[PDB]
Amino acid sequence: PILSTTTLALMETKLKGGAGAFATSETHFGNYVVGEIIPLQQSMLFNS
Amino acid sequence: LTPVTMDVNYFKIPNNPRGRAYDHREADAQT
Amino acid sequence: GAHSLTPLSMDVIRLGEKTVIMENLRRVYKNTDTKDPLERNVDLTFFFPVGLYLPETVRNALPTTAYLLNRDRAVQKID
Amino acid sequence: LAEAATDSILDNPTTYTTSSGAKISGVMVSTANVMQIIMSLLSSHITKE
Amino acid sequence: FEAIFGTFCNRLEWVYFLTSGLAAAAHAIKFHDLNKLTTGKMLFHVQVPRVASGAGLPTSRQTTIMVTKYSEKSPITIPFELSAACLTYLRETFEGTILDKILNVEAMHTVLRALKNTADAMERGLIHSFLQTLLRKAPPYFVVQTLVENATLARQALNRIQRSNILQSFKAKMLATLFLLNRTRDRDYVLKFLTRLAEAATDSILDNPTTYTTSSGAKISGVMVSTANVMQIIMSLLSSHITKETVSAPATYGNFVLSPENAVTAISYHSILADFNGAHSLTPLSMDVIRLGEKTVIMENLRRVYKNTDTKDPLERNVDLT
Amino acid sequence: LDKILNVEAMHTVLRALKNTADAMERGLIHSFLQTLLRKAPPYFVVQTL
Amino acid sequence: ALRIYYGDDPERYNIHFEAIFGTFCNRLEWVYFLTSGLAAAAHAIKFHDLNKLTTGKMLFHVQVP
């Protein structure tokens, strides 16, 4: 499964945020994110 | 001059100062 | 003839008391239109949901869109 | 990876020897990108015998 | 003696083009006159290797495609002044007295210093023109990266959305490495990015492997130039790879050869008429070589050629970010 | 001129012979690599073995 | 070279160099299989003809300690 996000605020706090945040899946009151199980995204965007 | 109802989500990611990437009848596929 | 040797130059790694020769096949497959068999093309499939519900005075919000990543690293939008 | 394989049946130890007394115990091939990354990542082990 | 002081006139740091580290990207040949050099093109007959690993597929190619590459001329000039009153002291061979000899040897030192000044500023102008011609050939890194990434899916049809995805992909590649060396301070990431620089280029057509060799058996596979600040940071950042070997530059310039095919052109043209009746020597020097993913690139600092001159270095641009 | 066309034909057939005898070796390395790729399992397979 | 490029008779014709360029044909980077690093996983033997080579099997008598 991949990085799925409902609103752009959680998107740009999870992508601007740091490193190793891609495996955390935080659930808000009604908003929710799921992260990728293996680091496939940040292995591509960080290594360029 | 810009509206106050414009989201700060637009300003975090790098985009144009117009708001558009003249026909605005087509929608935006980037945002 | 079967017991004669020659030296050359090669780059050797030492990997846990083992010596393995690294070798690059670029200099044999350069500028030829024969595709190197060492570069395959895997086909991984993903999946992602949109518009779920979370069970249980500002209320919660029910989603209707889903924002994903991109090869060009832009924010996607599926709704 | 290197300890996952097994020995071959007939192998002369006198061929494929380094300048010291270390017999070569295999071979690794790769493309340009991966081998360039490995060459620039583990230069404390990569030497030229 | 009223009062003595000390006066001293320094002689400038000399530099030749072949002894520089930049000459490992050149094939310079001393010709004589360019009036008989007619065209800008020069035909390169180049082979292509074909691997025969298919029993059902014969390649059936002639594999001797010729390429046409056009030249560009660039003159390099310098005004060169000389006082003629000193010149009369030399071209007339004065033999008067010891004071005549002293003014003679002073005029000799004057014209020798002027000759060394003009013959050394000519070489610095030559390195300037070579650097300018090489800067007018290199694309940015994301451009050649998007070229090699989109090599397999090149233009077969008109597709503007494909060009838009191309635009956004090199936009992301550009915003990844706008100022990468300013940004991070870890060695592994800049080593990986420099390796992806070094493997981004292609081979040149004609290159002798026997020239530009290190003390070991590692052929030099390129050259890197930079200014003072960036190269000083890289020297103080990756000292586990920077070492100082003895590279093997050519002894003098190459001398041109004449092909043996105009011989059979000239004999065939005589048949229409009524009746018929150094380049392989080397020298060592000292240069600092990096080892970058089984590639050896020469780092070179252009400070010692552009110091104290009022000619701005073309390697320091001025971008305008908004 | 007969000697010049002679040595030019010699260079032609020598370049053709070197081209075919060197592309044969590259095809040999291609076939050897293909035969070695048709023998290696993935790493987790031999690890679970 | 004087009789060769410029000609036999200097009168009523001359051979005039119109414009010269440079042409160069590279020779490719040679590679042999034994000198490659891949040949450290091989035991290659030059035979002559494979008509008398009947079977695909080859018996290996191997000890076990």
d(CA E122, CA E109): 20
Where would I find the H helices in chain E?
Answer: 84-90, 98-135, 141-149, 160-176, 180-183, 187-198, 228-235, 261-272, 303-306
Strand E41-45 relative to strand E243-245, pairing: unpaired
Q: Which of E228, E78, D27, E209 is nearest to F40 (CA)?
A: D27
H-run or E-run covering A45:
helix A42-45
Among G27, G33, G45, the strongest candidate for a mutation testing the F interface, having the largest count of F CBs within 10 A, is G33
CB G5 within 8 A of CB G15: yes
Answer yes or no: do D2 and C20 touch at CB < 8 A: yes
CB E224 within 8 A of CB E299: yes
Q: Which of E123, D46, E95, C47 is nearest to A3 (CA)?
A: C47
Answer yes or no: do E295 and D41 touch at CB < 8 A: no
Place of tokens 């000609």: G7
d(CA G38, CA C21): 8
Using a CB-CB distance cutoff of 8 angstroms, which residues of chain A are in contact with residue B9?
8-9, 12
List all residues 6 or more positions away from C3 whose beta carbon is below 8 Å from its beta carbon.
D14
Structure-token pair, residue B11: 């300003």
User: How many Cβ atoms from other residues are within 10 Å of residue E309's Cβ?
Assistant: 11
d(CA A35, CA A20): 10
Sheet holding D27-30, edge to edge: D27-30, C19-24, C11-14, D47-48
CB G62 within 8 A of CB D9: yes
H-run or E-run covering B11:
helix B9-12
Structure-token pair, residue E73: 């001329």
CB E242 within 8 A of CB E296: no
CB G24 within 8 A of CB E206: yes
> What are the φ/ψ torsions at residue E297 (nearest 5 degrees)?
-115, 135
d(CA F34, CA G50): 21
d(CA F10, CA C65): 73
CB A22 within 8 A of CB C68: no
Answer yes or no: do F1 and E49 touch at CB < 8 A: no
d(CA E279, CA E254): 5
d(CA A25, CA D15): 55
Among C26, C28, C34, the strongest candidate for a mutation testing the E interface, having the largest count of E CBs within 10 A, is C34
Chains with 3+ CB–CB pairs under 8 A to E are: A, C, D, F, G
Place of tokens 């011609």: E133
Helix (H, G, I), strand (E, B) or coil at A4: strand
Q: Which of E55, E141, F45, E206 is nearest to G27 (CA)?
A: E206
**Integer distance in angstroms from the first to the last C-alpha of chain G?**
79
CB E30 within 8 A of CB E255: yes
User: How many Cβ atoms from other residues are within 10 Å of residue E192's Cβ?
Assistant: 19
d(CA E108, CA E117): 14
Is F26 in CB contact (< 8 Å) with chain E? yes
Is G40 in CB contact (< 8 Å) with chain F? no
DSSP type of residue G39: G
Answer yes or no: do A4 and C60 touch at CB < 8 A: no
Measure F45 CA to nearest chain D CA, in Å: 11
H-run or E-run covering B10:
helix B9-12
| Experiment used for this model | cryo-EM
d(CA B31, CA E145): 26
Burial per residue of E94-116, b for 16 or more beta-carbon CB atoms within 10 angstroms, e otherwise: eeeeeeeeeebeebeebeeeeee
Answer yes or no: do D4 and F33 touch at CB < 8 A: no
CB A39 within 8 A of CB A23: yes
Measure D4 CA to nearest chain F CA, in Å: 7
Q: What is the DSSP string of chain C?
A: -TT-------EEEE-SS-EEEEEE-HHHHTT-SS--TT------------S------PPP-----BB---TT-PPP-B-
H-run or E-run covering D34:
helix D32-39
CB D29 within 8 A of CB F33: yes
Sort residue E91 into left (φ over 0), alpha (ψ -120 to 50) or beta.
alpha
Helix (H, G, I), strand (E, B) or coil at E213: strand
CB B9 within 8 A of CB A8: yes
CB D26 within 8 A of CB C18: yes
Strand E66-70 relative to strand E287-291, pairing: unpaired
Strand E41-45 relative to strand E66-70, pairing: antiparallel
Place of tokens 């060459």: D39
Nearest-CA residue of chain A relative to B12?
Answer: A12
Q: What angle do CA F10, F14, F18 make, to 5 degrees?
A: 175
User: How many Cβ atoms from other residues are within 10 Å of residue G21's Cβ?
Assistant: 12
Q: What is the DSSP string of G12-32?
A: S-----------EE-------
Strand E41-45 relative to strand G24-25, pairing: parallel
d(CA C67, CA C64): 10
Amino acid present at A15: L
List all residues 6 or more positions away from E228 whose beta carbon is below 8 Å from its beta carbon.
E301, E303
Q: Which of E150, E140, E233 is nearest to E178 (CA)?
A: E140
d(CA F28, CA F38): 15
d(CA E242, CA E298): 10
Measure E159 CA to nearest chain F CA, in Å: 36
Beta strands (DSSP E) in chain A are: 4-5, 33-34
Query: To the nearest 10°, the Cα dihedral for D9, D14, D20, D22?
Result: 10
Q: Which of D24, F14, D32, G30 is nearest to C24 (CA)?
A: D32
Structure-token pair, residue E103: 């003014």
Structure-token pair, residue F30: 């291609």
Is B13 in CB contact (< 8 Å) with chain C? yes
Is G1 in CB contact (< 8 Å) with chain E? no
Chain C (1-20) residues lying within 8 Å, Cβ to Cβ, of chain G:
8, 10
Sort residue B19 into left (φ over 0), alpha (ψ -120 to 50) or beta.
left
d(CA E214, CA E204): 19
CB D45 within 8 A of CB C7: no
Q: Can you name the residues that pair with E44 across neighbouring β-strands? A: E67, G24
Burial per residue of F18-31, b for 16 or more beta-carbon CB atoms within 10 angstroms, e otherwise: ebeebbebbbbbbe
Among candidates E199, E216, E241 on the partner chain, residue whose Cβ is nearest the Cβ of D32: E199
Task: Answer whether A touches G (≥3 Cβ pairs < 8 Å).
Answer: no
Burial per residue of E236-268, b for 16 or more beta-carbon CB atoms within 10 angstroms, e otherwise: ebbeebeeebebbbbeebbeeeeeeeebeebbe
Among F22, F26, F33, the strongest candidate for a mutation testing the G interface, having the largest count of G CBs within 10 A, is F22
Measure C21 CA to nearest chain D CA, in Å: 5
User: How many Cβ atoms from other residues are within 10 Å of residue C24's Cβ?
Assistant: 19
CB G30 within 8 A of CB E51: no
Long-range pairs, B21-29, Cβ under 8 A, ≥24: none
d(CA D7, CA D23): 13
DSSP type of residue G54: -
Answer yes or no: do C21 and G40 touch at CB < 8 A: yes
Structure-token pair, residue F29: 């390395």
Answer yes or no: do A4 and C49 touch at CB < 8 A: yes
Helix (H, G, I), strand (E, B) or coil at E44: strand
Burial per residue of G43-62, b for 16 or more beta-carbon CB atoms within 10 angstroms, e otherwise: eeeeeeeeeeeeeeeeeeee
Beta-carbon-side half-sphere exposure of residue E290 (alpha carbons within 13 Å) = 23
d(CA E124, CA E114): 15
Q: Which of E295, E196, E181 is nearest to E236 (CA)?
A: E181
Among candidates D9, D27, D29 on the partner chain, residue whose Cβ is nearest the Cβ of G62: D9
List all residues 6 or more positions away from E286 whose beta carbon is below 8 Å from its beta carbon.
E244, E246, E247
CB D49 within 8 A of CB D16: no
Q: Can you name the residues that pair with E287 across neighbouring β-strands? A: E245
Burial per residue of E3-40, b for 16 or more beta-carbon CB atoms within 10 angstroms, e otherwise: eeeeeeeeeeeeeebbebbbbbbbeeeeeeeeeeeeee
HEC string for E236-302: CCCCCCCEEECCEEECCCECCCCCCHHHHHHHHHHHHCCCCCCCCCEEECCEEEEECCCCEEEEEEC
The number of angstroms, rounded, from the C-alpha of E23 to the middle of its chain's C-alpha atoms is 5
d(CA E21, CA E247): 9
Answer yes or no: do G31 and F33 touch at CB < 8 A: no
Is F49 in CB contact (< 8 Å) with chain E? no
Beta-carbon-side half-sphere exposure of residue E113 (alpha carbons within 13 Å) = 12
Q: What angle do CA E86, E92, E97 make, to 5 degrees?
A: 80
Is E196 in CB contact (< 8 Å) with chain A? yes
Strand E66-70 relative to strand D27-30, pairing: unpaired
Using a CB-CB distance cutoff of 8 angstroms, which residues of chain C are in contact with residue F30?
28, 34, 37
Amino acid present at E100: D
Measure C69 CA to nearest chain B CA, in Å: 12
Q: What is the DSSP string of F1-49?
A: -HHHHHHHHHHHHHHHHHHHHHHHHHHHHHHHHHHHHTTPPPHHHHHH-
| Residue D31 burial class via C-beta count within 10 angstroms: exposed 0-12, middle 13-18, buried 19 and up | middle
d(CA E147, CA E195): 17
